[PDB]
Amino acid sequence: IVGGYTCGANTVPYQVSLNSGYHFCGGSLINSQWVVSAAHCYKSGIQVRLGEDNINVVEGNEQFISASKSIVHPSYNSNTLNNDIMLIKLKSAASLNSRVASISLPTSCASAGTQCLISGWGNTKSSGTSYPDVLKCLKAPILSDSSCKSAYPGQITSNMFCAGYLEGGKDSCQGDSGGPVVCSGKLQGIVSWGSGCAQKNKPGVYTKVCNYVSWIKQTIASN
Amino acid sequence: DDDLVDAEGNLVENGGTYYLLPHIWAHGGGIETAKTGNEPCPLTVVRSPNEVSKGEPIRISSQYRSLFIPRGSLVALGFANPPSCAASPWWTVVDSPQGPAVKLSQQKLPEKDILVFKFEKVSHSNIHVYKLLYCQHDEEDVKCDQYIGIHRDRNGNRRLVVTEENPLELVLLKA
Numbered sequence: 001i002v003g004g005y006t007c008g009a010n011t012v013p014y015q016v017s018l019n020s021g022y023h024f025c026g027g028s029l030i031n032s033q034w035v036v037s038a039a040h041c042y043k044s045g046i047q048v049r050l051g052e053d054n055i056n057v058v059e060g061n062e063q064f065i066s067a068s069k070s071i072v073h074p075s076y077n078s079n080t081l082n083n084d085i086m087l088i089k090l091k092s093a094a095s096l097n098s099r100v101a102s103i104s105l106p107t108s109c110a111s112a113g114t115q116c117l118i119s120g121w122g123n124t125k126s127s128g129t130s131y132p133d134v135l136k137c138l139k140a141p142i143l144s145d146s147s148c149k150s151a152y153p154g155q156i157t158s159n160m161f162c163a164g165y166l167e168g169g170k171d172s173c174q175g176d177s178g179g180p181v182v183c184s185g186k187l188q189g190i191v192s193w194g195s196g197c198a199q200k201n202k203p204g205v206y207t208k209v210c211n212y213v214s215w216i217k218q219t220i221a222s223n
Numbered sequence: 224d225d226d227l228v229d230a231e232g233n234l235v236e237n238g239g240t241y242y243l244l245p246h247i248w249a250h251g252g253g254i255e256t257a258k259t260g261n262e263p264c265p266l267t268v269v270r271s272p273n274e275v276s277k278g279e280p281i282r283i284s285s286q287y288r289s290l291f292i293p294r295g296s297l298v299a300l301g302f303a304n305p306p307s308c309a310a311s312p313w314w315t316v317v318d319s320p321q322g323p324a325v326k327l328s329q330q331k332l333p334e335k336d337i338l339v340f341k342f343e344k345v346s347h348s349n350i351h352v353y354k355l356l357y358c359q360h361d362e363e364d365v366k367c368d369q370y371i372g373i374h375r376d377r378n379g380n381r382r383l384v385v386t387e388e389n390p391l392e393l394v395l396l397k398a
């Protein structure tokens with residue numbers, strides 16, 4: 001997260017960290033035993049770590065749960081970055097408290113202009129690479145479909161949306177992937193892709209969760 | 224739990240800089256630019272004529288905002304230290320008297336013209352090595368059914384070009 005601020009310990013109780021020995025992708029808790037991330041964050045043997053702030057060290061609120069099932073969207077297309085969404089089932093329900101809580105799925109697509117909270121432990125600098133110990137936060141608005149496509153001609157499908165600033169300066173970055181984009185209290189997006197970080201005319205592109213919700217609820221209801 | 228790995232057995236960091244060397248130390252050194260034919264400056268991507276030269280530091284990037292390069296992801300390869308005239312440090316594939324060749328452009332290029340590569344590990348497992356695929360877009364389904372190879376020319380320049388039976392192999396070394 002470049003140009004953002006430190007969220008504060010467990011202030012984003014749904015922020016999850018996918019670990020494969022080390023942190024490689026964010027995720028979002030949607031209920032006691034199902035997590036949502038990006039399809040491109042798929043890996044075998046995922047350890048989902050919840051209630052985290054400082055991902056490097058243990059602080060007393062973490063909950064380490066091995067992944068049981070990792071279902072990547074059937075239509076994921078690694079080339080086109082399309083349908084970049086993945087579901088994760090925990091081998092064991094998570095104890096929901098104040099530090100660990102779920103985020104409501106969006107039953108309605110948010111309109112452009114809506115302010116969102118993007119979260120993650122990714123690089124916090126434009127040029128250069130500096131990963132944070134604790135969760136970084138960032139408020140950014142949903143951009144219009146015409147501007148999004150204006151920034152990325154020929155690369156935007158109806159399953160993705162831009163959020164951020166054409167001006168640049170503030171944005172999501174490497175290591176934020178799979179993380180949440182919560183707007184008006186609902187997981188409207190997932191950190192997916194983008195050209196560079198905080199670059200001009202190159203905002204973040206996120207998986208449009210609202211188109212996938214019916215699928216999410218279905219799979220959770222049959223897996 | 225992933226694929227793209229350098230020489231030292233460490234994960235290839237997205238946006239980081241690496242040297243691209245051959246598998247067999249007899250084909251050349253690292254990658255670099257060169258002035259070939261009728262170019263106004265170094266706009267041709269070739270292998271170092273040297274065989275011990277780490278070449279030029281090269282950045283490997285993916286659109287994805289992950290710490291590493293996701294398997295099957297298309298990537299762009301650019302010179303960490305761009306040359307003179309290049310309006311972008313990123314490689315692209317343009318038609319030439321020789322045939323499709325890896326060049327640098329003086330024209331600002333869009334994502335589509337640069338995100339046309341994709342690494343592919345080799346069968347001979349004894350050290351992390353990869354073949355470089357060339358993926359030209361189609362109709363919202365870019366197909367990687369071609370490779371990038373070496374074409375030594377009239378002046379000796381080992382220029383990188385698109386082949387289908389003379390693919391090159393590479394090992395990545397953190398710059």
Ligand SMILES: [Ca+2]
Binds near residue numbers: 052053054056058062
């Ligand atoms: Ca911790």
